Design a protein around this ligand. Structure first.
Ligand code: HEM
Ligand code: NAG
Ligand code: CYN
Length: 439
């Protein structure tokens, strides 16, 4: 198979990887007018995977992708069943299943009023704003913006790190069907794990859904002073290499919870001390599979974030089914010295989380429910893994094995990641946007 890179919305396969990103959530007021606008908007603004892999000199100043919710498709008279079990009812209806405290959800996510989302990526606020205004001007009264969420990469040497301080965007699956660099330890999967209607997709798709994908969008608020305070209060006293200062034990505890140091160094490779050079090297920072630690937790806890969401050899070998692409961006201001000192969040900050897969229930939702929320996953371990400390939602939020020298000790971890809303979207192919959606 040869993937038509010019026809696939770029954030799905390649990722915008821009310093700024805005999500404009909208409702359709006038289907006919919206469709008319779409036919001129799409060819001019919707960014393909082919554009994203081009030299920067060949790229526009901002990228735009576009997804629709179930109610958005219904509002546009697009009535064919896309074959996904969760997409039709929307994410609010699924939130309890994910483990969400529904009382923390906020409008306009508390229902299915949202019809779609424009995602705009740019390296600068000016261009982001201009392309946002271009949407407002092009579509006019045919849509109503019901929310806009804006994110930004963190400053300086924290660029690419999320708000707890950890380098993000290291490990992604690679799909066959196009020419790309594959790093050591990177999963290689058929394209239909990500793209609807391609090899590996087992869902029943309308023909027009070929080369689309489903986005699981999550708006997470993060409690950074609280996380920091918790790591200090529960600092690991020692590891194999020797005794730790409190600061060292706190840093180590954070790395044990994630499965990576803040630098990106995976603990399975660097189990006792950070290796920042390793973290920054894509030829090495993903080259592990837990095969050296299947039945003990010295090198990595069973319930660490990355291990829960991608179990690697904990599944007994390579498995295609549960991989997904991520294209998230942090939002909010840096955490001040006063905030960290108090141990109390004073400002709104977090992660605008984006995960793509052909089958919602096998990607995001499997990682969340079957794995992160499941105290007995990974399976067949000598010590109960417990609840994934970062995003596991089951209470009590108890996780074992964080202390490599006292692996039977359990940690009850306050929730530092608060879901504020989210939605399930379908991003069609570029041709489908104009030939089907706008028909
Ligand atoms: C605010 C919430 C979250 C934060 C701060 C966070 C942070 C991180 C970090 C620091 C990494 C390591 C970088 C990497 O390996 O690429 C990571 C990896 C990952 N996360 Fe999250 N994450 C969050 C939520 C989620 C959720 C909700 C899911 C899915 C249910 C998820 C799934 C994954 C996956 C699949 C990986 C890559 C694992 C691998 O391939 O080894 N994350 N995350
Ligand atoms: C390690 O810490 C313990 C206290 O937990 C202390 O008794 C011991 O002397 C320390 N060892 C070294 C080599 O500093
Ligand atoms: C995880 N992103």
């Amino acid at each position: 198979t040869i993937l038509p890179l010019n026809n696939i919305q770029g954030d799905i396969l390649v990722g915008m990887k821009k310093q700024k990103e805005r999500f404009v959530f909208f409702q359709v007021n006038d289907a006919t007018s919206f469709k008319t606008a779409l036919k001129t908007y799409v060819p001019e603004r919707i960014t393909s995977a082919a554009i994203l892999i081009s030299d920067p000199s060949q790229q526009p100043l901002a990228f735009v992708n576009l997804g629709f919710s179930n109610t958005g498709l219904q509002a546009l008279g697009i009535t064919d069943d896309l074959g996904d079990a969760q997409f039709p009812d929307g994410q609010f209806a699924d939130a309890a299943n994910l483990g969400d405290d529904l009382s923390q959800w906020v409008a306009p996510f508390t229902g299915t009023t949202i019809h779609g989302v424009f995602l705009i990526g740019s390296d600068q606020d000016d261009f982001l704003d201009q392309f946002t205004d271009d949407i407002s001007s092009t579509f006019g009264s045919s849509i109503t913006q019901v929310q806009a969420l804006s994110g930004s990469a963190r400053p300086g040497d924290q660029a690419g790190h999320e708000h707890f301080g950890f380098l993000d965007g290291i490990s992604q699956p690679s799909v066959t069907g196009w020419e790309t660099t594959v790093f050591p330890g990177q999963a290689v999967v058929p394209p239909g794990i990500i793209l609807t209607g391609r090899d590996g997709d087992t869902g029943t798709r309308p023909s027009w859904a070929l080369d689309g994908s489903f986005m699981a969008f999550r708006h997470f608020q993060q409690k950074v002073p609280e996380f920091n305070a918790y790591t200090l209060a529960n600092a690991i006293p020692a590891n194999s290499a020797g005794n730790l200062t409190q600061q060292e034990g706190a840093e180590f505890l954070g790395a044990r919870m994630f499965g990576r140091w803040k630098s990106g160094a995976p603990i399975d490779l660097a189990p006792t001390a950070d290796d920042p050079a390793l973290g920054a090297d894509p030829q090495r920072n993903n080259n592990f599979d837990y095969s050296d630690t299947l039945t003990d937790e010295t090198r990595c806890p069973f319930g660490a974030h990355v291990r829960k969401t991608n179990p690697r050899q904990d599944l007994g070998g390579p498995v295609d089914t549960f991989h997904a692409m991520r294209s998230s961006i942090p939002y909010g201001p840096e955490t001040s010295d006063a905030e960290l000192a108090s141990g109390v969040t004073a400002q709104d900050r977090g992660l605008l989380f984006v995960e793509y897969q052909s089958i919602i229930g096998n990607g995001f939702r499997f990682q969340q429910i079957n794995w992160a929320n499941n105290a007995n996953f990974p399976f067949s371990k000598p010590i109960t893994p417990g609840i994934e400390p970062i995003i596991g939602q089951t209470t009590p939020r108890t996780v074992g094995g964080l202390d490599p020298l006292n692996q039977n000790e359990t940690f009850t971890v306050p929730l530092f990641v608060i879901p504020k809303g989210g939605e399930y979207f379908f991003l069609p192919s570029i041709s489908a946007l104009t030939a089907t959606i706008a028909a």
